[PDB]
Ligand binder design. Structure first.
Ligand SMILES: *[C@@H]1O[C@H](CO)[C@@H](O)[C@H](O)[C@H]1NC(C)=O
Lengths: 535, 61
């Protein structure tokens, strides 16, 4: 108890943080702060509960356990897949959050950025290297929070209508951290009136679920969704499908028929591992970019389906930043589509392309799949292996990320929100994924967080320069709601996306470039036509 | 021979399986997630695909 700068009293008790070394200076890190009672035993599948107060001074100088989850071991020793594996021990006792503040502590309420990690709602941890907020804190005087939330069955196994397995508890874990940030961020120097949520993939989808669920809507002011949305083919399931998957998983693990109460009771005697060993076997169709337990439309957290909610809510008070990377679908292909591997060029046959469309668009009818092949084929060169390979990538990315985002952008803008859109086109120089994958899902995260700002990490000067710009837009968006500049009339402006002009920008090494229409003709296919062909 | 070893919940570590076969257990239909690796050659299950090797090191990759 010497550095009064690392000593903090939150409502729960006293905490002791740790001074960390960014590249230009030091930061106050308060790691492993328990924001809820461990959701184990009888609490499994249940809504989180506030952490009871503690006496004494709790040590907050380390990252806590990671929520029990599947570890992606497709490519042993490959950094592409392993940089996402948990980097701390797995435990159901995992509801802890982290806070980074500059060093010393700030003298005036600083704007807060809360990060929600992605990982298809089946994996993830706020303690991975890519989410290191020491950089945003040191370089932008940012106050950054990041929490752990249950994933997989623990975070989302549901039996809609039951009290012992209501569903969406992983999203509630998220909200509780949001509540925590409210009641305590002040003690660290963070303005509780300027909270900005931001996430990628499932994190971005989570963020969107917060905007859509009123209770969570009053705990933040702005939001950023990178490569993901609440609306879309994979972020949510119907209560019928949730129950379907929960009761099928239950069957697989020996639990046992079965009424809710006793089915869930049996599920709670089950070893964590045992649930994860069966998690991947309840999906309804052979597919990719599909996860077993995701948020469920329960009519509670989600009053109605995201689609409904985004065409009818009022987003006048909303300020959003949304975007996607160049090759949203690249690496998912490698998880089951005949012909794709990271090890070769993955050139495919028209026949493979046809088989691939069914796997990439798993819920599509024979007719819908048929329409997809039509749209994505270049009828001049209908068999060029390369074009087919790229088209497959595009099918998957457009269906799951690009078009759901454009739809979101559109609907929000069309309802009073001030939306800003982007496309991330810079492929990192250190990228270990094959060059054909371009700029893969999730590879803008490092730049936003500022990791190339670390001399210790191999990158180019351009890249470090690039990083700062991003760190800047985000934080400016974070504190003002506008990504631009409180002074120096930046010669290259980022205009808000509107249904009229549909402008958005390209984030890459070159200066900003303004473009119109997010894959406009293609997303009309996805968002306006296909849904009529599947009803 | 050295091989990878792991469950659905652990990172891939490398171990000496001595002179036994190695295995790669993954989901047989998409999504083809790898469910585990280790020593031996446990029978496949049509729902779970199991490929086995005998050499060289890291062959169950
Ligand atoms: C690429 O590798 C996968 C498995 O290693 C294989 O199925 C596919 O046919 C290969 N493609 C090429 C370039 O032959």
């Amino acid at each position: 108890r010497e550095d009064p700068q690392l000593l903090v009293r939150v409502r729960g008790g006293q905490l002791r943080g740790i001074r960390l070394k960014a590249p230009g200076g030091p930061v106050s890190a308060f790691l492993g702060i328990p924001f809820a009672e461990p959701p184990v035993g009888s609490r499994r599948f249940m809504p989180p509960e506030p952490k009871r107060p503690w006496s004494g001074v709790l040590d907050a100088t380390t990252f806590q356990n990671v929520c029990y989850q599947y570890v992606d071991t497709l490519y042993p020793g490959f950094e592409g897949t392993e940089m996402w594996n948990p980097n701390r021990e797995l435990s159901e006792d995992c509801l802890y959050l982290n806070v980074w503040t500059p060093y010393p502590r700030p003298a005036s309420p600083t704007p807060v950025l809360i990060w929600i990690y992605g990982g298809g709602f089946y994996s993830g941890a706020a303690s991975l290297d890519v989410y290191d907020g020491r950089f945003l804190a040191q370089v932008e005087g940012a106050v950054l929070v990041s929490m752990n939330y249950r994933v997989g069955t623990f975070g989302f196994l549901a039996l809609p209508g039951s009290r012992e397995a209501p569903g969406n508890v992983g999203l509630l874990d998220q909200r509780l951290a949001l509540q925590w940030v409210q009641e305590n961020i002040a003690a660290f120097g963070g303005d509780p009136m300027s909270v900005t949520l931001f996430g990628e993939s499932a994190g971005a989808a989570s963020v969107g679920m917060h905007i859509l669920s009123l209770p969570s809507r009053s705990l933040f002011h702005r939001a950023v969704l990178q490569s993901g949305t609440p609306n879309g083919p994979w972020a949510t399931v119907s209560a019928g499908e949730a129950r379907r998957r929960a009761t099928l998983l239950a069957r697989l693990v020996g639990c046992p028929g079965g009424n809710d109460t006793e089915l869930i009771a049996c599920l709670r005697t089950r070893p964590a591992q045992d649930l994860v060993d069966h998690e991947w076997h309840v999906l309804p169709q052979e597919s990719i970019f599909r996860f077993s337990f995701v948020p469920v439309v329960d009519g509670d957290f989600l009053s109605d389906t995201p689609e409904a909610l985004i065409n009818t809510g009022d987003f006048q008070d909303l300020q959003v930043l949304v975007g996607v990377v160049k090759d949203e679908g690249s690496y998912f292909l490698v998880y089951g589509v005949p012909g794709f591997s990271k090890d070769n060029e993955s050139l495919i046959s028209r026949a493979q392309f046809l088989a691939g469309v069914r796997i990439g668009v798993p819920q599509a009818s024979d007719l819908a799949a048929e329409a997809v092949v039509l749209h994505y084929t270049d009828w001049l060169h209908p068999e060029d292996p390369t074009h087919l390979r790229d088209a497959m990538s595009a099918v998957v990315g457009d269906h799951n990320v690009v078009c759901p985002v454009a739809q979101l952008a559109g609907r929000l803008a069309a309802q009073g929100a001030r939306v800003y859109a982007y496309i991330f086109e810079h492929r990192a120089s250190t990228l270990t994924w094959p060059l054909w994958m371009g700029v893969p899902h999730g590879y803008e995260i490092e730049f936003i967080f500022g990791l190339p700002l670390d001399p210790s990490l191999n990158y180019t000067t351009e890249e470090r320069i690039f990083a700062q710009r991003l760190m800047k837009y985000w934080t400016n968006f974070a504190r003002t709601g506008d990504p631009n500049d409180p002074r120096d009339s930046k010669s290259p402006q980022w205009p808000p996306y509107t249904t009229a002009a549909q402008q958005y920008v390209s984030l890459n090494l070159k200066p900003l470039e303004v473009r119109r229409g997010l894959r406009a003709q293609t997303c009309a296919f996805w968002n306006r036509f296909l849904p009529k062909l599947l009803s | 021979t050295m091989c990878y070893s792991h469950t659905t919940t652990s990172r891939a570590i490398l171990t000496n399986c001595g002179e036994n076969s190695c295995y790669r257990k993954s989901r047989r239909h998409p999504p083809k997630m790898v469910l585990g690796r280790g020593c031996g050659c446990p029978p496949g299950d049509d729902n779970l695909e199991v490929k086995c090797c005998t050499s060289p090191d890291k062959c169950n990759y």
